[PDB]
Amino acid sequence: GHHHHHHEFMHVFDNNGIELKAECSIGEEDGVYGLILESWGPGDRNKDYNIALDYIIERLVDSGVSQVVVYLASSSVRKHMHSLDERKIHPGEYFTLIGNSPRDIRLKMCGYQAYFSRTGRKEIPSGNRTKRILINVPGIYSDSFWASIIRGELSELSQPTDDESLLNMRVSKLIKKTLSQPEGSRKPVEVERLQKVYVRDPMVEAWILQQSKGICENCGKNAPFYLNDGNPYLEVHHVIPLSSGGADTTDNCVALCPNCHRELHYSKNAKELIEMLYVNINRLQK
Amino acid sequence: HHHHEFMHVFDNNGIELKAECSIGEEDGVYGLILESWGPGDRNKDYNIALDYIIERLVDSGVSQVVVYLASSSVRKHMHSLDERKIHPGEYFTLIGNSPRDIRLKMCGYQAYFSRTGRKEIPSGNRTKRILINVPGIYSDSFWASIIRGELSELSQPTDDESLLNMRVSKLIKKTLSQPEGSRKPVEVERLQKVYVRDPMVEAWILQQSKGICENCGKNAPFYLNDGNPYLEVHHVIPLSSGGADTTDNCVALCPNCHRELHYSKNAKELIEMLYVNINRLQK
Ligand SMILES: [Zn+2]
Ligand SMILES: [Zn+2]
Ligand SMILES: [Zn+2]
Ligand SMILES: [Zn+2]
Structure with missing residues (x-):
């Protein structure tokens, strides 16, 4: 039921159950399915992007997700990059969460977003680090799974x-x-x-x-x-x-x-x- | 207003035989139209292909068929379907010790026709363009299974x-x-x-x-x-x-x-x- 009713944005809950300023949604786009974290906007619209992303990574790891796939999901990238292999922000097929703390994983994830521009891939990571992104866990198509990650x-x-x-x-x-x-x-x-x-x-x-x-x-x-x-x-x-x-x-x-x-x-x-x-x-x- | 799905008859192992046919409707009659054993060895194994057809028809419950001549000469010179029907009696029945002997009965009837009409002495070809009709059946997928096994x-x-x-x-x-x-x-x-x-x-x-x-x-x-x-x-x-x-x-x-x-x-x-x-x- 995605037609005739303006879908409202979900918000990531912190560890105390309280709503963050961090718009997100659960859906499929262009053949890939997962959690779509909205970008940090002009004028501080999604002020809690980074901290919200910290909690998502934290909860995926505690629920047993070893590896994920993160795609660049701003409207420009999807126009100018048609393949899934090129829209992915990280080298190799699977971004692992096992190695380090959720902040370190996030810094790196946010870092790889800078290597993208609106035309295509940049030479240096000069860009913005808080863009619209889609987080895929391979094998998972359950809306209730992603619901619990947002919920906490x-x-x-x-x-x-x-x-x-x-x-x-x-x-x-x-x-x-x-x-x-x-x-x-x-x-x-x-x-x-x-x-x-x-x-x-x-x-x-x-x-x-x-x-x-x-x-x-x-x-x-x-x-x-x-x-x-x-x-x-x-x-x-x-x-x-x-x-x-x-x-x-x-x-x-x-x-x-x-x-x-x-x-x-x-x-x-x-x-x-x-x-x-x-x-x-x-x-x-x- | 005639429609046709063109095919070759297949054997039990899926090999395309030299015996072209179609699932078509011509003059109101719908069925398997097996092409002629031609003048220069066109459709070499017509008789082989017809034995498979008779075998498969009997396997799927069909005991009775109507067989019409469907050559374009006969079409022109013979003006009713009743005279185009090769066998006496409303149906030709698929009964016998073998599909091959049944085929010999069926092709025996074909000899009683010339290109222009019915022949007093059966001194004609036994391997002609014919339409095998099963009235009641109007499924392409049924005939496809008779043609391709x-x-x-x-x-x-x-x-x-x-x-x-x-x-x-x-x-x-x-x-x-x-x-x-x-x-x-x-x-x-x-x-x-x-x-x-x-x-x-x-x-x-x-x-x-x-x-x-x-x-x-x-x-x-x-x-x-x-x-x-x-x-x-x-x-x-x-x-x-x-x-x-x-x-x-x-x-x-x-x-x-x-x-x-x-x-x-x-x-x-x-x-x-x-x-x-x-x-x-x-x-
Ligand atoms: Zn192997
Ligand atoms: Zn073993
Ligand atoms: Zn098992
Ligand atoms: Zn497979």
Whole structure:
């Protein structure tokens, strides 16, 4: 319901539950979804930008978010830069929050905004450091997650949930802590849900599997196991995902073993392997 | 006002036969229009292609057809459909020991016609342009399945991942020309039934594995960002089947081993070996 009703801006709450002068919103823009922090304006409109950003980073880390992706989201940048790889403010595919304190992470984040102008990228970080920005956590499409980050009341890490992205996020943090044997649920709670899924083409899948000849196209190795019908098991992967508006065509699909298909989603060196395949496989067109 | 979807008849393995046809409507009659075995070996394997058609028609419930001559000479010189009908009786029935012997009956009737009209002595061609009509049926997708076999049904796109797998599995057997596909696929909001899952259970299981799988020995395929070893937790008795979300019903596996327990037929035996090796598990 984003039509006929002028959406009002949400404001980030401090640790005492009190509203900050720091406009924000939760939404999707140009294929990417997350928290859109509004810019520090002329005449001190969003005076608490920096301190509000400190709290967001703080709360993401305590909720188990290790890595994020921050995009430049002022109206000019989105016009003059059409790709997602270029609108991102930081080098590498994922900005990590693990290393340092929330202020240090923020200073750096605010710093990388200065390397942008309205035409494009600058030689030096001379620009403004308090622009409109979009913070993406990969895998997370939940409005309630971002709502809690703005609100300041977070869920406990042990909290059960139906969201599998939210589960993984919490586990990734729980692995670092010493866990005693948890009791669990002998009768787990089922829940009806809606999910968005794309209609896929069996011919594009089937064509890509035949051409592979049952060998993974990233690593050189052959398929791990065989199906009941006798065929080898690989998994077809869209190099430009369908969530990010990619095509369902043979010229951006690739057959991989389960392990490599996982590598390309989550690995620390995932940017190397995705470019590597655009050289090797000549049908793959970016 | 005639419409046509042009095709070649396919065999059971998806190979394009030398037997061009169409799903068309001509003079009110809608059906499969199989082109002639030509003057210079045009449509070489007409008779082969017609056997598949007769086989598929019988497989899909059709026992009766009407066959008209549809050559442009006959069209001109024979002025009613009733005289263009090759067989006596309202229908030609698809019954016999073989589709081939049925085809010989059907083509036997064709010999009783010249290019200009009906022939007193059957001394004519047995391999002519004909329209195979099934009155009552007006589906292109029905005739597409008669023309292309099971390959036309299996090629249909879907959101259902289980059905997408059944179809893909069967399409790997067939020979396939290049698909093209869609450059802007449609997203569907569909209903789903998921379970509320405990992250203490999952995180405990991943800790006690120490980065190695519980059916193959190997380490994690890659180290996840922030240095974690990448494995996947899987419920040995599914939550669908009344499985508990407990440490005694979970195992850590690499993606290869995870898919192996799901999609193999030999998975039902792999499960048994987890109860032997991993003595934590209860059932
Ligand atoms: Zn994929
Ligand atoms: Zn591989
Ligand atoms: Zn599983
Ligand atoms: Zn394994």
